[PDB]
Structure formats: structure tokens, C-alpha cells
């Protein structure tokens, strides 16, 4: 009973590690995405800035 | 004192008459425009006129993970 469910209960630790790197890989490019945009936004008020 | 109001507007406009920025500044308009213009620009940053966002971002390379199982 315990190594038939030894391998059962490992099967399910197994598809765990797949949905954490799917997410953790999907989100870390993405918080590059906007803080590209963010450091344009900040430089398009820093010439506009100087000038007022 | 209307007769002061009078002699404060019609010196005003005497003002009003003016070619390049300052009447009587020579050398003390002059080095103060330029010292406070420095000032605004030295702690701040050194920016151009019209010079957009030059730049490229390189995100986290994605490793894998090796994992002999069973």
C-alpha cells in the first residue's frame, strides 16, 4: 500500500513544480515589460522638466 | 496721492521700452542669469532639448532544473 502510494503521491509533487516555474517565468518577464515603459515615461516629463 | 499714481504707471511704461532682457545689468545681469542658470541644470542632470529614452532592458534568463525521479 505505502509504495503504491509512494509513487501516486509523488506523480502530484511532480506537476507541482511545473505550474510554479510556468507562472514564476511568465511574471518575471513581465515585470520588465512595463518598467521598460516606466523609464521612457520618466524621461519624456525630464526633458519637459528642464524646460519649465 | 493720485499724483503718485500717476508717476509710477508713466514710469512703467518707460519699461516697457526694452531690446535685450536687462536695462542696466552689465556685468552684475549678466554672471547672475548665467550662475543661477548652471544651478538649475548642475545638482539636476545634464538633458538636451529633444532627445527621447535610449536604452534596452535584458530580462532573467530562465534556467531549468535537473531531476532524476521515481
Not at chain 1, 503504491?4 to 511574471?27: C, G, P, T, W
Not at chain 2, 493720485?2 to 526694452?18: A, N, P
Not at chain 2, 542632470?45 to 525521479?69: I, L, S
Request: proline fraction near 4%; avoid cysteine; hydrophobic fraction near 30%.
Amino acid at each position: 500500500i505505502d509504495l503504491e502510494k509512494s509513487q501516486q503521491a509523488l506523480v502530484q509533487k511532480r506537476h507541482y513544480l511545473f505550474d510554479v516555474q510556468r507562472n514564476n517565468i511568465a511574471m518575471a518577464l513581465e515585470v520588465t515589460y512595463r518598467e521598460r515603459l516606466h523609464r521612457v515615461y520618466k524621461e519624456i516629463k525630464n526633458r519637459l522638466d528642464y524646460h519649465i | 496721492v493720485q499724483k503718485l499714481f500717476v508717476d509710477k504707471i508713466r514710469e512703467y511704461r518707460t519699461k516697457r521700452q526694452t531690446s535685450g532682457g536687462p536695462v542696466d545689468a552689465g556685468p552684475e545681469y549678466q554672471q547672475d542669469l548665467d550662475r543661477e542658470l548652471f544651478k538649475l541644470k548642475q545638482m539636476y542632470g545634464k538633458a538636451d532639448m529633444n532627445t527621447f529614452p535610449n536604452f534596452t532592458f535584458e530580462d532573467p534568463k530562465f534556467e531549468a532544473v535537473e531531476k532524476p525521479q521515481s
